[PDB]
């Protein structure tokens, strides 16, 4: 679910419900072996 | 490969490495003691004496102490971030001073035996600083034992709480679940400090 | 492609079309004046007199001026994008002040003639601003003529330069090279600026941080005294001497607390704006001070002679403010006038030795009035003001006979750089080799002879033109024979 129609807004993704109370529920984003953040993947051309 | 990442912009509790850290932690201990040993904390045991009479300006605030209302005094006072007052506020500020003094004294002793002080002036000053920290520990434990432990001339008590003191904690840990030490151990601890 | 690239934080030079543009360029003129007429530029003409002895701390910075080293003092100082100092820096900052006051005055004259101001209060304020700029042109020309032109009691000069002044520009253009004016032309220009500016500025002082009529009277009296005309000097000093009270103190610490603070000193006719963040500077040459925790420790590059210390009686208030016994922790005296001001402090507990610029105080108007009254043959006025000044300072003079005047003027203006002009005007030779040093400071302050003897009428009392001039225009006649 993406909570804003802002062009600089990233989505909130939950796999199998919310796990914790008082912690984050975002997954681990890996791009080509090393991990990233969603704001960094926003700068990569998705046709690659 | 060491993977300790210490926070930049603040210090944290650890054994000391310099004399300026010891001096600054001592000044913070005294600024903490100023808000603990206040006249405003000792007014509740002044009003519970036989020398006061409440007036019509009261709003049942100074009234549970002068009139001996044993239903309000059983769980009185609050110690959240908005206000520290009452019997719970008394207990909170004196256990807070006891834990901070424990941290300062144990860190200064570890720094004295670890030989981190350069000249002899800093060693002599740090030994006097350690003695001041021990006096503040004895003051905190005595001011808790004064109100929360029974005098010997008491008739009827809970079964087992006749010769018990306060929870004698000697190290720094905020999460501590322990039993009450006996009264003799608490008085020997104060007098040895 | 458009290839137009224009700077950031910088606008273009335009003629004045508003009233707020005139106010902005006037405030820029005053902030330029604050970095010109500050005590750091008048230390060179103070050390060159016969009152200082270099210590062993000196790294050849003050030693050309004290010991009169004419091989260095010919081409001395820098003025570039790194440093501005020396004789060349003294020349550059007053020529820059003169040119920028010219630009301000001509632009606001043309804006007054083109009728770009709205009301009548804007016309009145613009005319007051014009007179305040005319005073600053007068000050810049006079302070260049003070150092780079001969007094009339000079013997040997470069042939043709005894009745010459400085290069006189009366309108702003930076592309002008020309010959030197005469002394009469420059002095009529200075006095025309001052007399045209007294008739416009109001009667009472608007602010202590801006030019008033009191400052124009005080500057005109100073120029008339240094010219050699005592009647007009007394007549101009009489109009400003009774509006500013002296410091009323009972002991030396009260005099230190009222004297050192610019905001509470009740006898300042004109001074520059200074805060802890804008307008303050350290002037630690004559005393060599350095903060250390909460106190001050001194390492001076030059200390006064014993005859300078013996001018002050032991109960004088200036013998712990103007000179202090702080060399080698208690052993000797230094000139401690520009120490500090406790208002311009980062933390109130720790010193940073920052002062501000003061342009005139009333204790020089008293000395101008006493000297002019003594020279024009008026004895009750000279006593009436010398007893008042010396009793407010702590120790009163018994007899007034122009030896007391010389002693009191030497005692009162120390560090301000007026002794070289006085010992030219009074026909006093150097005698630096004959003086003894302070006996408590031996090992630190010792005997160095002069590298050039300076009798009465020596050419080297006035400075030589810097060597960017005499190179860029060869119709400039230099001063010295060598």
């Amino acid at each position: 679910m993406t909570t804003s129609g802002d062009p600089t807004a990233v989505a909130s993704v939950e796999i199998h419900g919310t796990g914790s109370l008082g912690a984050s529920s975002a997954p681990l984003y890996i791009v080509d072996g090393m991990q990233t953040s969603l704001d960094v993947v926003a700068t990569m051309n998705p046709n690659d | 490969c060491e993977l300790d990442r210490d926070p930049e912009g603040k210090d944290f509790q650890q054994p000391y490495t310099s004399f300026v850290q010891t001096k600054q932690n001592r000044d913070g201990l005294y600024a903490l003691l100023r808000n603990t040993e206040n006249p405003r904390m000792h007014f509740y045991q002044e009003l519970q004496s036989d020398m006061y009479c409440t007036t019509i300006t009261d709003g049942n605030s100074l009234a549970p102490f002068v009139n001996w209302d044993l239903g309000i005094l059983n769980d009185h006072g609050r110690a959240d971030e908005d206000e520290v007052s009452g019997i719970a506020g008394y207990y909170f500020v004196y256990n807070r001073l006891n834990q901070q003094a424990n941290a300062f004294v144990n860190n200064t002793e570890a720094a004295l035996q670890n030989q981190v002080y350069k000249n002899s002036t800093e060693i002599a000053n740090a030994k006097s600083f350690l003695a001041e920290g021990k006096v503040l520990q004895a003051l905190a434990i005595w001011r808790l034992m004064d109100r929360f432990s029974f005098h010997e001339s008491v008739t009827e008590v809970n079964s087992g709480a006749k010769d018990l003191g306060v929870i004698l904690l000697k190290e720094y840990n905020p999460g501590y679940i322990g039993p009450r030490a006996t009264k003799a151990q608490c008085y020997d601890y104060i007098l040895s400090r | 492609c458009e290839l137009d690239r224009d700077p950031e934080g910088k606008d273009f030079q335009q003629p004045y079309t508003s009233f707020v543009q005139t106010k902005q360029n006037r405030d820029g003129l005053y902030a330029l004046l604050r970095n010109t007429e500050n005590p750091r530029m008048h230390f060179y003409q103070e050390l060159q007199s016969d009152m200082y002895c270099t210590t062993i701390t000196d790294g050849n910075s003050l030693a050309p001026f004290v010991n009169w080293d004419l091989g260095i003092l010919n081409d001395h100082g820098r003025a570039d994008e790194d440093e501005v100092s020396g004789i060349a820096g003294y020349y550059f900052v007053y020529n820059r002040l003169n040119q920028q006051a010219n630009a301000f005055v001509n632009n606001t004259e043309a804006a007054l003639q083109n009728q770009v101001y709205k009301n009548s209060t804007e016309i009145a304020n613009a005319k007051s601003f014009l007179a305040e700029g005319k005073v600053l042109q007068a000050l810049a020309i006079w302070r260049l003529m003070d150092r780079f032109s001969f007094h009339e009691s000079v013997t040997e000069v470069n042939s043709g330069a005894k009745d010459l002044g400085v290069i006189l520009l009366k309108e702003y253009n930076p592309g002008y090279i020309g010959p030197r004016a005469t002394k009469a032309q420059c002095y009529d220009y200075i006095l025309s600026r001052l007399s045209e500016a007294i008739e416009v500025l109001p009667e009472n002082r608007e602010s202590v941080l801006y030019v008033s009529r009191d400052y124009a009277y005080a500057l005109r009296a100073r120029i008339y005294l240094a010219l050699g005309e005592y009647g007009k000097a007394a007549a101009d000093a009489k109009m400003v001497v009774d509006k500013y009270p002296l410091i009323g103190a009972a002991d030396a610490s009260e005099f230190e607390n009222i004297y050192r603070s610019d905001a509470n000193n009740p006898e300042i006719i004109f001074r520059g704006f200074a805060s802890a963040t804008l307008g303050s500077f350290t002037a630690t040459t004559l005393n060599g001070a350095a903060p250390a925790g909460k106190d001050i420790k001194y390492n001076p590059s030059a200390v006064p002679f014993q005859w300078v210390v013996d001018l002050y009686e032991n109960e004088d208030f200036r013998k712990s403010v103007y000179i202090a016994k702080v060399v080698k922790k208690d052993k000797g005296y230094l000139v401690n006038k520009f120490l500090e001001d406790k208002a311009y402090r980062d933390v109130q507990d720790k010193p940073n030795l920052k002062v501000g610029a003061r342009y005139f105080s009333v204790a020089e108007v008293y000395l101008i009035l006493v000297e002019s009254a003594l020279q024009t043959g008026d004895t009750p006025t000279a006593e009436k003001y010398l007893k008042a000044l010396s009793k407010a300072r702590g120790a009163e003079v018994s007899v007034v006979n122009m030896e007391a005047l010389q002693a009191e003027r030497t005692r009162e203006l120390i560090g301000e750089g007026s002794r070289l002009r006085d010992m030219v005007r009074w026909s006093i030779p150097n005698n630096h080799d004959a003086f003894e040093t302070q006996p408590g400071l031996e090992g630190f302050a010792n005997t160095t002879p002069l590298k050039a003897q300076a009798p009465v009428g020596f050419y080297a009392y006035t400075w030589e033109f810097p060597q960017r001039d005499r190179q860029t225009n060869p119709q400039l006649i230099k001063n010295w024979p060598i």
Partner: protein, 333 residues
């Protein structure tokens, strides 16, 4: 003048990492020549040692600690299925669908406690239920006097009062995280000319509409524009309505909980690959492609506030999602 220093947050040297154990059982099947394909998966996901800033006892000398206490269990089933529906040599029709149902339950809290309410959030953690909403129920109005009425927690006969207080809030049986998630899709391609459509639904999602605190408000904030249903307010002449009198201020009760379940036509593309016979006597250009796309074209919702999805637990002054029309080229030369 001199700096002093003192301990302020207290830490703990036994911070763990929020442990989790997950058990999984799945079954995958493929029907006639791998055309119809199905997949079903059951999971139990248990979390222990969650990170809470718990309120400490008074011997600590601090107010909180950040320790690892708690438990939680997520039980669910998710299934997906693909299919291909030919009718010809050229035609290709295909379809797909997903479904996921997830039930959250809190198991245990910190210090012997059975129920904890985070301050200034509006939720409640109760053992045996998911994290729910924490508000006062709203009965309606009383048409004898025209005043608002809230239910009482307990007191079953229920009993309603006309005076709001903070001791009237209770646990609402509507969860914060929506339980049912899915999405299905069609597709058809004649010869080159393809048409794809994707739908995505979330049902079970509740959301506080915070702008209806202002746009339907009888007393206060009177300079703003209001809703049209304030034109038949309760007076003594018109007393058969359900909107209150004009002198009252609304609360954050459960008349602001809206049902933000939706179904969104997330994508709809029309592609046309240019045919191979057009690039015949040439070796420069290899192929081409044209497409027309529409994003967020159609939405089926009972919400009242410009977007069900834009938000998350509360809908403030929000940026709604966009509806886009895109045309595109591709020259694979």
């Amino acid at each position: 003048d001199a700096m002093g220093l003192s301990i302020s947050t207290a830490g703990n040297p036994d911070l763990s990492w929020e442990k989790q154990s997950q058990f999984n059982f799945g079954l995958a099947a493929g029907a006639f020549n791998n055309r119809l394909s199905a997949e079903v998966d059951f999971y139990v996901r248990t979390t222990n040692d969650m990170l809470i800033d718990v309120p400490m006892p008074y011997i600590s000398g601090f107010f909180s600690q950040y320790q690892n206490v708690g438990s939680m269990k997520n039980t669910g089933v998710d299934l997906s299925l693909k299919g291909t529906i030919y009718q010809n040599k050229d035609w290709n029709v295909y379809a797909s669908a997903n479904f996921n149902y997830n039930r959250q339950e809190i198991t245990k809290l910190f210090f012997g406690l059975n129920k904890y309410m985070l301050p200034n959030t509006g939720t409640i953690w109760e053992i045996g239920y998911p994290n729910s909403f924490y508000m006062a129920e709203y009965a309606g109005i009383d048409k004898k006097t025209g005043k608002q009425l809230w239910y009482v927690p307990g007191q079953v006969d229920k009993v309603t009062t006309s005076q709001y207080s903070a001791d009237l809030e209770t646990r609402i049986d509507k969860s914060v995280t929506p339980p049912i998630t899915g999405g299905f899709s069609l597709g058809a391609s004649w010869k080159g000319l393809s048409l794809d459509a994707d739908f995505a639904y979330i049902v079970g999602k509740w959301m506080i509409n915070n702008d209806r605190y202002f746009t339907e408000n009888g007393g206060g904030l009177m300079q703003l524009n209001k809703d049209k249903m304030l034109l038949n307010a309760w007076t003594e002449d018109n007393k058969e309505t359900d909107v209150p009198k004009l002198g009252q201020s609304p609360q954050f009760d459960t008349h602001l909980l809206e049902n933000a379940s939706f179904l969104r036509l997330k994508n709809l593309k029309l592609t046309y690959v240019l045919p191979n016979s057009l690039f015949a006597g040439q070796n420069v250009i290899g192929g081409a492609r044209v497409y027309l796309m529409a994003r967020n074209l159609l939405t089926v919702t009972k919400y009242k506030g410009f977007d069900p999805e834009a938000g998350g637990n509360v809908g403030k002054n929000q940026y709604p999602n966009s509806k886009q029309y895109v045309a595109g080229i591709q020259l694979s030369f």
